[PDB]
């Protein structure tokens, strides 16, 4: 929303990731807080926090081959009638 | 050139392997410029982008292909990174080929006419 990979001058250099840097940084590892995020785009975010000591390794999350195709299915059509024939593990083989 | 390795499969038609930068690949590659400014300094360079290899692991990756070229032509500048991304933008927006079998190879006398 500043731009992005473009933008103006700034080294990503944000008013509020700043602030998120500040206190996840004064916080004590012993409380049980984990901190998840996630980003649509891997790399014109802050590589101050993919640094040591702050949100360390990356997961990618690829799309939905075919176990997660039938799950996902089943569990988007478990509040509403289905008939009998309705051949969920075709599909989710046939929707690449 | 074009060795007597068989081409296990590829749009080129020659049935044969291509020899390129010391690798044998199926096909031979698309190349297009690309622009680089940095320091008030200028350079061209054509950048060579192999696609559709039988093998996966052969096939060109952008940010092997774009910190090539900012090592070759700026090896030691500073915040070079941000020229490194200008540069990835640049190739991705180039090779989005509408139709994936859009193939026009390198024009190489002789070894294709």
């Known amino acids: ?96 | 050139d074009r060795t007597n390795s068989r081409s296990t499969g590829g749009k080129c038609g020659c049935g044969f392997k291509h020899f390129w930068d010391g690798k044998e690949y199926d096909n031979l590659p698309e190349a297009f410029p690309i622009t680089l400014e940095w320091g008030g300094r200028v350079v061209r360079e054509t950048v060579y982008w192999f696609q559709y290899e039988s093998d996966s692991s052969l096939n060109s990756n952008v940010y092997d292909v774009a910190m090539k070229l900012v090592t070759k032509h700026f090896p030691g500048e500073f915040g070079s990174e941000i020229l490194v991304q200008k540069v990835v933008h640049t190739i991705l927006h180039q090779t989005a080929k509408k139709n994936p079998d859009d193939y026009t190879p390198v024009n190489i006398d002789g070894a294709h006419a």
């Open chain 1, 1 to 96: 929303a500043r731009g992005g990979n473009i933008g103006d001058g700034g080294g990503a250099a944000d008013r509020v990731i700043n602030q998120i840097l500040t206190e996840m940084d004064g916080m004590s590892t012993k409380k049980n807080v984990f901190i998840i995020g996630a980003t649509n785009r891997p790399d014109i975010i802050d590589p101050a926090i993919l640094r040591p000591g702050r949100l360390d390794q990356l997961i990618y999350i690829p799309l939905p081959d075919e176990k997660s195709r039938v799950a996902i299915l089943k569990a988007n059509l478990r509040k509403s009638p289905v008939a009998k024939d309705v051949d969920l593990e075709f599909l989710a083989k046939m929707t690449n």
